[PDB]
């Protein structure tokens, strides 16, 4: 009992994404296949299910004319094609499959799939611009120290930030990254170390950026002020 | 149908018991609802099929109850696995969901503030961070002051889970202009309001 989905794409705006999603452990005719979407902190939204023994599919009004549900059932695959993509369909697209009710409510979705990841946008990749958050008297309050790294303008997602190649692991935040107006992410790490060891220890923040394989360390000096 | 759920923000200490709730306005009585457990990084996880029938491998103290219109899911002692967001369905309709928080003493952010550095000034672009560490609850209003006049549309914020060690949150708060904009005034600062306190650290450019 599994479903497995097809690996996470990037598209341009205005273009078509097919997601697939094949099914084991189960007859895949005797029940339908659902397909939900979720944006990046927003909810579950679904989309529409599909018969696999006819093939008469039923969508939600929000899509229909852009999404075309198909399936093989020699491979016991489902197909969901979105097209006409817009910015705020960045979303991650599961397939979910209703369990046999007693009452014949068939949208119990007791299995799922792992999702598939499809960001839209019109930018190109990009390595992150890493600058230090240096430590100083503005960020020195009472023998604790606060310093950080930058990461600003990368695409596509995700980064990986550490410190001191992960020596140091106690209060560090790295913050999500938020998607800026140019269309690039950027997000920032932080940790806090003591004052006293400011002038003795080295920080070094780690990013990797590995859809530019791109791999930045920087080395956050102190600043005098 | 349209469900709706509250509280969206759930605060309750391990070990109590969490009441949730979802409300199927726009439809009959159709008790054909069910109840979901989604954790970062995962697909949704059936808990309750129906009114009150517990899906299988869900533990006891997960239940569901309903009457017409409102639906209850209680979780009779919260475990750690537990604090998680829950959605409720009702045929293709998902309410806006429900967050389990685990709740802890209120504390105050470590207020900080970073000038952009003058590598990144170099590249016409500034940047300036304003950062909370370890404060609870989530609540938090964050206002950036340049010259004592407060800006708009110019800044992003975003927040940290919950720490697994003391349960607190994070904000970073960063403030984006252009070199040009930087170097035409000196003060800055952001002003962290939080429960009748607000905190504003600034800085001068120069110096």
């Known amino acids: 009992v599994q479903l497995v989905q097809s690996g996470a794409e990037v598209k341009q705006p205005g273009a078509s994404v097919k997601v697939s999603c094949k099914a084991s452990?189960?007859?895949?005719?005797?029940?339908?296949m659902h397909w939900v979407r979720q944006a990046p902190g927003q909810g579950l939204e679904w989309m529409g299910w599909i018969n696999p023994k006819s093939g008469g599919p039923n969508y939600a009004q929000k899509f229909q004319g852009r999404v075309t549900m198909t399936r093989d059932r020699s491979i016991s695959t489902a197909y969901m094609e979105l097209r006409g993509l817009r910015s705020d369909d960045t979303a991650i697209y599961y397939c979910?499959?209703?369990?046999?009710?007693?009452?014949?409510?068939?949208?119990?979705?007791?299995?799922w799939g792992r999702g598939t990841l499809v960001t839209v946008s019109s930018a190109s990749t990009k390595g992150p611009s890493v600058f230090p958050l240096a430590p100083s008297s503005k960020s020195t309050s009472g023998g604790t120290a606060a310093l950080g790294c930058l990461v600003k303008d990368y695409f596509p997602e995700p980064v990986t930030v550490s410190w001191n190649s992960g020596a140091l692991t106690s209060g560090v935040h790295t913050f999500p990254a938020v998607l800026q107006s140019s269309g690039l992410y950027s997000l920032s790490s932080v940790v806090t170390v003591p004052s006293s060891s400011l002038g003795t220890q080295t920080y070094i923040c780690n990013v990797n950026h590995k859809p530019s394989n791109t791999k930045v360390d920087k080395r956050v000096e102190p600043k005098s002020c | 149908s349209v469900l709706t759920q509250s509280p969206g923000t759930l605060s309750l200490s391990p070990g109590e018991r969490a009441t949730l709730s979802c409300r199927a306005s726009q439809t009959v009585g159709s008790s054909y609802l069910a109840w979901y457990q989604q954790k970062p990084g995962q697909a949704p996880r059936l808990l309750i099929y129906?009114?009150?029938s517990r899906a299988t491998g869900i533990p006891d103290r997960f239940s569901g109850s309903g009457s017409g219109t409102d639906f209850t899911l209680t979780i009779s002692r919260l475990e750690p696995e537990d604090f998680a967001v829950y959605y409720c369905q009702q045929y293709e309709a998902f309410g806006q969901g429900t967050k389990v928080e685990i709740k802890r003493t209120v504390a105050a952010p470590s207020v900080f503030i970073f000038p952009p550095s003058d590598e990144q000034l170099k590249s016409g672009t500034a940047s300036v961070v304003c950062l909370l560490n370890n404060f609870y609850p989530r609540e938090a209003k964050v206002q950036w002051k340049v010259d004592n006049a407060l800006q708009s549309g110019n800044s992003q914020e975003s927040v940290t889970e919950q720490d697994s060690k003391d349960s607190t949150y994070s904000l970073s708060s960063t403030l984006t202009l252009s070199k040009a904009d930087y170097e035409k005034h000196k003060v800055y600062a952001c002003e962290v309001t939080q429960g009748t306190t607000s905190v504003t650290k600034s800085f001068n450019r120069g110096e």
């Open positions: 129906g009114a009150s």
């Open positions: 979910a499959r209703p369990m046999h009710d007693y009452d014949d409510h068939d949208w119990y979705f007791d299995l």
């Open positions: 452990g189960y007859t895949f005719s005797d029940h339908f």
